[PDB]
Design a protein around this ligand. Structure first.
Ligand code: CHL
Ligand code: CLA
Ligand code: CLA
Ligand code: CLA
Ligand code: CLA
Ligand code: CLA
Ligand SMILES: CCCCCCCCCCCCCCCCCC(=O)OC[C@H](CO[C@@H]1O[C@H](CO)[C@H](O)[C@H](O)[C@H]1O)OC(=O)CCCCCCCCCCCCCCCCC
Ligand SMILES: CCCCCCCCCCCCCCCCCC(=O)O[C@@H](COC(=O)CCCCCCCCCCCCCCC)COP(=O)(O)OC[C@H](O)CO
Ligand SMILES: CC1=C[C@H](O)CC(C)(C)[C@H]1/C=C/C(C)=C/C=C/C(C)=C/C=C/C=C(C)/C=C/C=C(C)/C=C/C1=C(C)C[C@H](O)CC1(C)C
Ligand SMILES: CC1=C[C@H](O)CC(C)(C)[C@H]1/C=C/C(C)=C/C=C/C(C)=C/C=C/C=C(C)/C=C/C=C(C)/C=C/C1=C(C)C[C@H](O)CC1(C)C
Ligand SMILES: CC1=C(/C=C/C(C)=C/C=C/C(C)=C/C=C/C=C(C)/C=C/C=C(C)/C=C/C2=C(C)CCCC2(C)C)C(C)(C)CCC1
Lengths: 42, 198, 97, 193, 153
């Protein structure tokens, strides 16, 4: 299990997980707040 | 009397407990450098004292206005009120006086016990004192500055800064007074929370 | 204006300033400023046409005012005089304010 | 010291007149540079000292102000006025020519002297009342000159800034505007329009 | 009306562009029955377009002569939300990422084989240092003041 967790900590697997989570977050943000050209909250 | 913000977590090495109000709460390691900690103690003290004065000024007049003793505008509507001088002259006067007093405070921060003396009437001088707690004229009632008083002051300051953050965020989301928000919460709490204002 | 009067006045004032007022400073600056190449002057480096004319710059004036200074300060005076004349003739130029 | 609780720079020791240890940029590290700065500062302060009454008095006597007195040269064929009377030879080429002729040769002899003390304080014909004979009063008058001259330089900065803020008017008009109702018309209105 | 630009909520060409978009979407919509999934998708797209145009009009954007919104980055307070506020947010996030990466590189600098901690990321230390970039401006300013940000080699 330690070796498998070490494999999960290697550069491509960790990069894939991180970038997939980031892409999912950005896609969900773009669904819930679509067509954002300005920052109108202030 | 030290305590822990998190019972499981261990205190950092630079937070041994000499400073008042030490609960080991530096998870982001901002005050690892001793000079940084020395600056941040003064920053916390000044911010907390100003937050005390500010939260009192935006809470107690509003409470008295709601009761009916006085008719004072809200803290967000007090800028547009009428005074004997315009806001620009008041800002300039405040800038001049604050420049002087805060430059004096900054000299004491940089080197303690260096600006304790009056520059006009040289016979007047503050007694020797720790940085951040200038005795003498600033303590007319001669209250003892024990570490219990310092801890109580820091706790009230942290509560006041949290209250001011709540003040500004609540006015940003609802556009009404914080005591009005408290009254709305007390009307029926389970449908007047953070949730139903979004 | 009268071109002769203005030209004579400006040339006389410029020559007066060069002879009396700004003479010692100029002489000290030419004493400190001499063109040299590779640590030696242009003439002694091998250039036969870079020799300074010591005969043309020798003068009988008590302070050393020579013909080249006369030409330079007269050029200043003539330029100033013609600037004055051409500006005074024109009844315009940054006047509306 | 200019700034209490702040260490003095190594270039300044307080021996000079008006030496309050103020050099944040360290301009006067080189001693001959510091001597040149002393001479230039003294000349600047003396010129501003001659300036300040020369600006206030013509405004107080109702002759305009220190910006009206330069309007005539802007106009084509302008005529200068002194005490309300037009000077017959007061035209821009003649005034500029006599200013260049006489302002030079009086700034030239000032550069002929090599003594630094004589470059700052020449004495002789310029001290006819004998105020520099006693040394202690000489240093006291040096300090008084330095302080009043720095005040004059600050006053001239105020002159320029108030002229930029309020174009085409006089400093005494600004003083009267402040004295009319000080809580409403001041630097605050221009600092926050 | 900065730089001769009409506001997008008072621009005829903006409404014209919305009309062309809605007309094209309706022409695509006419090929299917209204109760079908493609028709519902097209209707959702039309509603999204209408909401987008209304939001662009109400946001205060200045529309050019071609009917498209033009951003102003000169710093005008009416248009601080186009560049300056998103720019500040981006600078905060980028400083967060850079500070976290620099802290991780500093932490694994004095090891036996530091490169092994770069090909294989040590996740607990990285997750410990992830939130240290929340206060990145304060930490960076103090490190610059104490002379720890730069290396004198
Ligand atoms: C402590 C910081 C401080 C904060 C957070 C605010 C916060 C606020 N002020 Mg105030 N002010 C502050 C100091 C000062 N204000 C004013 C004078 C005014 C004016 C004249 C006005 C505000 C207004 C406002 C509001 C929006 C800006 C907001 C509630 C405005 C308002 O009431 O809402 C639009 C407004 O018109 N403030 C002065 C005197 C120059 C201050 C001196 O430090
Ligand atoms: C040069 C850099 C660049 C920049 C500055 C922009 C800028 C922008 N893009 Mg464009 N884009 C670019 C290159 C760029 N793009 C490229 C190369 C492509 C092709 C791959 C695209 C394709 C594209 C698409 C497909 C879309 C955009 C959109 C957007 C907008 C923001 C999206 C969003 O809603 O954020 C919302 C806010 C955030 C995600 C902030 C997250 C902050 C986190 C949550 C932290 C919060 C802090 C605590 C904005 C106008 C969107 C749009 O509608 O434009 C009008 C969109 O749909 N862009
Ligand atoms: C106003 C700024 C401020 C500052 C400068 C300090 C400074 C300090 N705190 Mg205090 N504190 C504050 C507010 C502040 N505090 C508040 C609001 C609370 C209640 C939540 C506390 C509660 C607290 C505890 C329980 C403890 C400290 C302690 C410390 C010390 C080490 C941590 C550090 O230096 O962080 C520097 C912090 C800042 C520069 C804050 C900047 C703001 C950040 C970047 C984000 C803004 C967030 C906000 C939600 C919006 C130092 C004396 C520790 C101690 O040893 O005391 C001596 C300790 O254990 N503090
Ligand atoms: C210091 C104590 C404090 C107190 C007593 C209150 C009190 C109140 N808040 Mg405020 N608030 C605070 C700080 C505080 N706030 C802070 C720091 C923030 C910034 C996140 C806010 C932001 C905020 C919002 C966005 C809203 C309120 C509103 C409310 C009221 C309804 C409850 C709610 O919806 O969720 C309360 C939400 C919070 C995030 C809780 C913060 C409590 C902090 C962490 C301290 C708790 C520590 C200690 C045990 C007490 C309630 C009377 C709501 C309203 O408008 O009222 C009608 C609402 O919409 N508050
Ligand atoms: C520092 C040098 C200085 C300079 C350059 C000026 C320059 C000027 N003065 Mg001022 N003045 C000065 C000092 C100076 N003054 C002092 C010390 C006093 C007090 C005695 C005065 C009192 C006066 C008067 C002037 C006037 C003038 C102007 C006309 C000059 C003229 O000769 O005709 C000229 C712009 C005239 C004026 O007011 O302009 C309309 C006027 O009649 N001055
Ligand atoms: C040396 C002393 C000095 C004195 C006594 C005055 C006096 C005066 N000034 Mg001037 N001024 C000075 C120097 C001085 N100034 C300098 C150095 C500057 C450049 C920053 C200015 C720039 C200035 C402006 C921009 C304005 C005035 C105006 C005024 C009037 C009152 C408002 C005020 O002073 O704002 C406070 C001024 C400053 C902070 C400058 C420093 C003065 C310190 C105390 C010395 C009053 C006539 C106002 C006016 O015109 O009246 C209606 C106004 O609008 N002054
Ligand atoms: C079917 C899909 C499952 C494939 C994995 C299961 C067989 C692989 C080997 C295994 O489990 O050996 C068992 C190994 C290690 O188990 C023992 O561990 C010991 C350490 O004390 C020694 O290394 C022994 O040699 C080793 O056999 O367990 C793992 O490391 C497996 C980790 C969990 C794997 C998750 C599978 C999901 C992802 C699949 C891709
Ligand atoms: C904008 C103008 C910025 C001017 C920068 C040039 C000044 C010198 C830079 C030196 C520096 O970066 O470090 C200093 C700290 O930085 C500064 O003082 C500059 C801060 C710049 C940010 C604030 C500028 C004003 C912003 C207004 C808004 C001093 O540190 P030190 O060399 O004494 O450190 C030695 C160390 O302890 C080891 O011995
Ligand atoms: C410590 C730590 C640690 C770790 O390591 C990391 C971390 C976590 C990051 C950190 C932090 C934390 C926190 C929480 C903080 C906070 C702060 C605040 C909030 C402040 C305030 C602060 C605040 C303040 C001062 C305030 C002030 C106020 C005032 C003046 C007022 C004024 C006023 C009045 C009266 C009235 C009128 O009508 C209006 C006005 C004019 C407006
Ligand atoms: C050396 C010698 C030598 C020999 O041996 C002998 C003898 C001759 C004696 C000697 C000499 C002497 C002399 C000449 C002196 C002079 C002086 C002066 C003039 C000063 C000034 C001085 C000056 C000064 C201080 C100044 C000051 C100023 C001021 C405050 C100002 C104010 C103001 C006002 C109100 C108003 C406006 O709105 C602003 C202003 C403008 C800001
Ligand atoms: C002998 C002598 C003397 C005398 C002297 C004299 C008298 C001199 C003169 C001198 C002169 C008398 C000089 C002059 C010079 C000049 C020149 C050298 C030239 C100039 C010019 C130029 C260079 C150019 C011009 C032009 C033209 C071409 C046209 C257009 C415009 C112009 C202006 C550009 C005496 C008695 C004192 C003493 C003894 C000795």
């Amino acid at each position: 299990m330690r070796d498998f967790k070490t494999y999960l900590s290697v550069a491509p697997v960790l990069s894939t997980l991180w970038f997939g989570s980031l892409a999912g977050l950005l896609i969900e943000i773009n669904r819930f707040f679509p067509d954002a050209l300005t920052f109108p909250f202030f | 009397k030290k305590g822990e913000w998190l019972p499981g977590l261990a205190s950092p090495g630079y937070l041994t407990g000499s400073l008042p109000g030490d609960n080991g709460f530096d998870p982001l390691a901002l005050a690892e450098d001793p000079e940084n900690l020395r600056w941040f103690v003064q920053a916390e003290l000044v911010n907390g004292r100003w937050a005390m004065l500010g939260v009192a000024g935006m809470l107690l007049p509003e409470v008295f206005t709601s009761i009916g003793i006085i008719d004072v505008p809200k803290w967000y509507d007090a800028g547009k009120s009428e005074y004997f001088a315009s806001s620009s002259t008041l800002f300039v006067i405040e800038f001049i006086l604050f420049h002087y007093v805060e430059i004096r405070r900054w000299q004491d921060i940089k080197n303690p016990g260096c600006v304790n003396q009056d520059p006009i009437f040289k016979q007047y001088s503050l007694p020797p004192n720790e940085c951040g707690y200038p005795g003498g004229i600033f303590n007319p009632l001669n209250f003892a500055p024990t570490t219990e008083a310092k801890e109580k002051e820091l706790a009230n300051g942290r509560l006041a800064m949290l209250a001011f953050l709540g003040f500004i965020v609540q006015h940003n989301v609802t556009g009404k007074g914080p005591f009005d928000n408290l009254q709305q919460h007390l009307s029926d709490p389970w449908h007047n929370t953070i949730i139903q204002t979004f | 204006l009268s071109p002769s009067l203005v030209i004579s006045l400006s040339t006389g004032l410029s020559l007066f300033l060069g002879r009396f007022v700004f003479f010692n400073f100029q002489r000290e600056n030419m004493a400190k400023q001499v063109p040299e190449q590779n640590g030696m002057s242009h003439f002694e480096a091998g250039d036969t046409r870079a020799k300074e004319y010591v005969s043309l710059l020798k003068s009988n004036d008590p302070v050393g005012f020579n013909i080249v200074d006369v030409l330079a300060w007269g050029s200043i005076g003539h330029i100033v005089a013609y600037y004055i004349l051409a500006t005074a003739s024109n009844g315009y130029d940054p006047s509306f304010f | 010291e200019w700034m209490p609780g702040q260490p003095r720079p190594a270039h300044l020791d307080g021996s000079a007149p008006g030496d309050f240890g103020f050099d944040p940029l360290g301009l006067g590290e080189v001693p001959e540079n510091l001597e040149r700065f002393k001479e230039s500062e003294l000349i600047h302060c003396r010129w501003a000292m001659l300036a300040v009454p020369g600006i206030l008095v013509p405004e107080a006597l109702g002759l305009g102000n220190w910006v009206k007195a330069q309007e005539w040269a802007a106009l084509p064929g302008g005529q200068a006025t002194y005490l309300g009377n037009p000077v017959p030879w007061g035209n821009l080429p003649t005034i500029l020519a006599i200013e260049f002729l006489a302002i030079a040769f009086v700034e030239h002899q000032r550069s002929m002297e090599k003594d630094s003390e004589k470059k700052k304080y020449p004495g002789g014909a310029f001290d006819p009342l004998g105020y520099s004979k006693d040394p202690k009063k000489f240093e006291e008058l040096k300090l008084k000159e330095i302080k009043n001259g720095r005040l004059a330089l600050l006053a001239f900065v105020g002159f320029c800034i108030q002229q930029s803020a309020y174009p085409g008017t006089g400093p005494l008009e600004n003083l009267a505007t402040h004295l009319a109702d000080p809580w409403h018309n001041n630097i605050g209105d221009i600092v926050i329009p | 009306d900065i730089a001769g630009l009409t506001p997008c909520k008072e621009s005829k060409q903006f409404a014209k562009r919305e009309k062309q978009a809605l007309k094209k979407l309706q022409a695509s919509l006419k090929l299917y029955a209204d109760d079908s999934a493609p028709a519902l998708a097209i209707k959702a797209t039309m509603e999204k377009t209408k909401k987008r145009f209304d939001n662009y009009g109400k946001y205060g954007l200045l529309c050019g002569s071609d009917g498209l919104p033009h951003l102003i980055v000169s710093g005008d307070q009416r248009h601080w939300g186009e560049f300056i506020t998103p720019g500040i947010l981006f600078l905060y996030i980028a400083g967060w990422i850079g500070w976290v990466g620099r802290s991780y590189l500093i932490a694994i600098r004095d090891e036996k084989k530091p490169t092994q901690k770069e090909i294989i990321i040590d996740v607990p230390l990285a997750s410990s240092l992830l939130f240290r970039g929340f206060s990145w401006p304060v930490a960076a300013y103090r490190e610059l003041l104490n002379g720890e940000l730069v290396d004198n080699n």
